[PDB]
Design a protein around this ligand. Structure first.
Ligand SMILES: Cc1cccc(C(=O)N2CCC(C(N)=O)CC2)c1
Length: 171
């Protein structure tokens, strides 16, 4: 069975219990913590591409009001985010299973941009999601996995200084 696990869940859970935040910029900012995924049960010899996207966890705008994140009352449907291809793609099962698949080079932006960068809506809450796509093979196959532990609100600057401190402590 294809097994997908989150590396350093311990640390992600510290961020999550405070409400995690990720900076977005016009040029695009890398993520801390980095999404690192443990994958077992691939065909070592089959060919796969690893895809990352961000699901809008709800349809609301969030604001930091008197030291607390609170959703707006005016939901709007959230268009699905663009997909980031792990730059090791495509590659053999063996490659993907020999070390955690680490999305260290994805950049989160607030502006439609050249390419690579993933545009998110500021003050929306996001749930990272991967797709493992069997490529080249006779039968195309996709397996998808969500990472609740890695939810965050996209921000142009940190609101909760407890997050600022955790980010610095662990970077
Ligand atoms: C058919 C399929 C499905 C999913 C992912 C891929 C893939 O790994 N790339 C990377 C290289 C290319 C690019 N320009 O980034 C796009 C296709 C291919």
């Amino acid at each position: 069975e294809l097994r997908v696990g989150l590396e350093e869940s311990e640390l992600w859970l510290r961020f999550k219990e405070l409400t995690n935040e990720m900076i977005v910029t016009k040029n695009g900012r890398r993520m801390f913590p980095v999404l690192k995924v443990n994958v077992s049960g691939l065909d070592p010899n089959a060919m796969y591409s690893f895809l990352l996207d961000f699901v809008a966890a709800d349809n609301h705008r969030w604001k930091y009001v008197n030291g607390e994140w609170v959703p707006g009352g005016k939901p709007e449907p959230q268009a699905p985010s663009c997909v980031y291809i792990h730059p090791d793609s495509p590659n053999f099962g063996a490659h993907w299973m020999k070390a955690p698949v680490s999305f260290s080079k994805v950049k989160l932006t607030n502006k439609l941009n050249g390419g690579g960068q993933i545009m998110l809506n500021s003050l929306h809450k996001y749930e990272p999601r991967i797709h493992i796509v069997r490529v080249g093979g006779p039968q195309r196959m996709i397996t998808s996995h969500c990472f609740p532990e890695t939810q965050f609100i996209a921000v142009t600057a940190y609101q909760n200084e407890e997050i600022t401190a955790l980010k610095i402590k662990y970077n």
